[model samples]
Target: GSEAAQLLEAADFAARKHRQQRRKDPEGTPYINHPIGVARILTHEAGITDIVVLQAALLHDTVEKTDTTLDEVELHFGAQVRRLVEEVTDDKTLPKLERKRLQVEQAPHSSPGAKLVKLADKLYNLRDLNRCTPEGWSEHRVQEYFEWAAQVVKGLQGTNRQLEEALKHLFKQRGLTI
Candidate 1:
């Protein structure tokens, strides 16, 4: 019961951090929706009750995708949430392709909680990409992303079958049974 209030607080903090951002969806949906979706998938779909995981999910992209930093996360949340967020974050300073390669290589070694959050992130991103890709992104681009994302999720096998199954459902829809 108390955790539910904390969840909303985390959501509020995330929305404030990402207020200026927008997703690439055709409607240009508010970026807050992305983290909310990730948390939703973890809770409503993946049946997770670890409030730390929920809080970390809401702020997962803040350190990577925005001006927010780990100090702020630790201050607002705590070390556990900060660690999970850090574990799941990509190094933004690296080239995009290099960062992606690291994700695939590092997936299995990540913490169990990190793996769950990562899987939910992939599930949400894949859903968004398929819903309506960014403007002018080629068929080749979408195809490659689906494949790359699958590789990332592939390394994440045996972690959370529910999320893995959901992702595979999308892959099969696109004939990408890898």
Candidate 2:
């Protein structure tokens, strides 16, 4: 799709923006992999193909993680995609937990484009936990991961059913029950 290609370019720009950034993971993989994986989840798993959604997916963390400004994104991509991206951007001024909580609170009210991208984001992240070896991810880290992940998925419940079902399967597979 043209959208995926456009978003890929946007993601490439993100790479340039985050050129100096590294994954905090002990393995030190490129942080860009996370966004690419999440984009795959949105396209293949969630069956979402909207150009705006894809573009916003690539630019999702730019506002929160990089020095990119929402005004720049709005000027470049227009108001709708900027609003979608803003819906998911974390407010760094708040305490970490509160910022996370606010995302959950605002998610349902977010546009469908943002909801789909967010669900795709969480699904990929939860899948990542499955890749971690015991030595790599501690029990506490895993638990915290699931806890936060579940909240993001819960926020998807009212907005997107496919993502909600995927998250349900994830939680159920753990036998931990959300």
Candidate 3:
């Protein structure tokens, strides 16, 4: 099916765009793994089959973390995917705190498709935090991060039961309530 065919293309594009980057993990995991994980959660956990959503998931970090532009995303994946990508991409110009703040603030109002992706995004982050936290994050910072993610996820309710339940399980692992 062309759905999967294009999803692969999106993955290839995202892989190349993030080729030089790595996660903040001390071991420096490849950044592409993060996005791939996002897509996997959307598919395997959330059971999302929307090709545009998956494509946007693959491209979510490109605009914020790399030189990739929204126009380029639209050119390759069309405006539907671009819109979802834009919904999830943070403004790099803003301070990091503001970006995170805005995510929680804007999360409730984000498009439903964007909400699904956001749920998956936070799910992956919390999971990775458990796996191996980003370098330099203090214990308090890590706890606070869980709190913030729960807050953002608050708005994502009703998107997908499986994804939400998965998140709740992680939150429990951290002694957080969502």
Worst 10 residues of 2 by lDDT: 128-137
Candidate 2 local lDDT, 6-115, one digit each (tens): 78677887777767776655676677777777777777877877778877887788888989999988987888888988888888889988987887677667777888
Model 2 stretches with alpha carbons more than 4 Å out: 1-5, 133-137
lDDT scores of the candidates, listed in order: 0.91, 0.77, 0.90
lDDT, candidate 2, at 143 = 70
lDDT of 3 by residue, 1-178 (tens): 5887998999999999999999988999999998999999998988899898998899899998899999999999899999999999899899999998998899888998899889998989888888886899887888898999998998889889999999999888889888
Model 2, residue 59: C-alpha shift (Å)? 0.8
lDDT by residue for model 1 (1-178), tens? 4998999989999999999999987788999999999999999999999999999999999999888999999998989999999999889889988998999999989998999999999899888887888877877898789899888888888888899999999988887884
User: Cα RMSD to native, each candidate?
Assistant: 1.2, 2.4, 1.1
Scored against the true structure, residue 32 in model 1 reaches a CA lDDT of 98
Model 2 TM-score is 0.87
